[PDB]
Design a protein around this ligand. Structure first.
Ligand SMILES: *[C@@H]1O[C@H](CO)[C@@H](O[C@@H]2O[C@H](CO)[C@@H](O)[C@H](O)[C@H]2NC(C)=O)[C@H](O)[C@H]1NC(C)=O
Ligand SMILES: *[C@@H]1O[C@H](CO)[C@@H](O)[C@H](O)[C@H]1NC(C)=O
Ligand SMILES: *[C@@H]1O[C@H](CO)[C@@H](O)[C@H](O)[C@H]1NC(C)=O
Lengths: 98, 98
């Protein structure tokens, strides 16, 4: 929900990249705000395949109160189901580390 | 009789910054911020019409540095506390006092 005061002739609202970030609902004349659902980058920490095949995974600039429903946890293999939620979870300023 | 108090660190702050260093920090204002963990922000709020949210919503991120601002201050304190008590000798071997 928004605080935007639409004039009666306007339907949508745009921003600096020309994408709609506010709309008027066509049944109850109220103004909603649009925001994309969360994304980011994924990088893998490895000690080299010579030493081991055990890796760690860093999710950039998020919290891990929001990770396991973002990544396809139950939709994918069990092998991505250890690196989505486990007992080794640390929160850093570069995102949180699993 | 030499007084290095304004360039050596003081313990009262929560950092190792001297009196000239935080004078230097409060003069470089930013055209855009870096990371304030603005990813819980920009979702669902109405004050999302700054620069950084519109950048971040199009794939454009900012990665954090490896050394923080509290490690660089420890480096420049260790460089400055060796010049005073050793002179030119600590950068050629072992610190010999004089
Ligand atoms: C080195 O210079 C500083 C700054 O002039 C001196 O710090 C002052 O110390 C007196 C104590 O008599 C205080 O009343 C002032 O408020 C201090 N000034 C500041 C800016 O904090 C310091 O005393 C000098 N060092 C020596 C050994 O005299
Ligand atoms: C039909 O549209 C009007 C427009 O104001 C709205 O008030 C009303 O609730 C709508 N009725 C429905 C969706 O059954
Ligand atoms: C995300 O993590 C940071 C650091 O732990 C915390 O300050 C912030 O409140 C978290 N966001 C939540 C809990 O929505």
């Amino acid at each position: 929900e928004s605080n935007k005061k639409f004039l009666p002739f306007q339907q949508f609202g745009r921003d600096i990249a020309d994408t709609t970030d506010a709309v008027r609902d066509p049944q109850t004349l109220e103004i909603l705000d649009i925001t994309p659902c969360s994304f980011g980058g994924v990088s893998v920490i490895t000690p080299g395949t010579n030493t081991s095949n055990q890796v760690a995974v860093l999710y950039q600039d998020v919290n891990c109160t929001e990770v396991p429903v973002a990544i396809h946890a139950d939709q994918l293999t069990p092998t991505w189901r250890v690196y989505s939620t486990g007992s080794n979870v640390f929160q850093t300023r570069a995102g949180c580390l699993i | 009789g030499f007084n290095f108090s304004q360039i050596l660190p003081d313990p009262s702050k929560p950092s190792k910054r001297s009196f000239i260093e935080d004078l230097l920090f409060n003069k470089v204002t930013l055209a855009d911020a870096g990371f304030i963990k603005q990813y819980g922000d920009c979702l669902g709020d109405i004050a999302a019409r700054d620069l950084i949210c519109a950048q971040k919503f199009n794939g454009l991120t900012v990665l954090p540095p490896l050394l923080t601002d509290e490690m660089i201050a420890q480096y420049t304190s260790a460089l400055l506390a060796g010049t005073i008590t050793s002179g030119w000798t600590f950068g050629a071997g072992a610190a010999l006092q004089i």
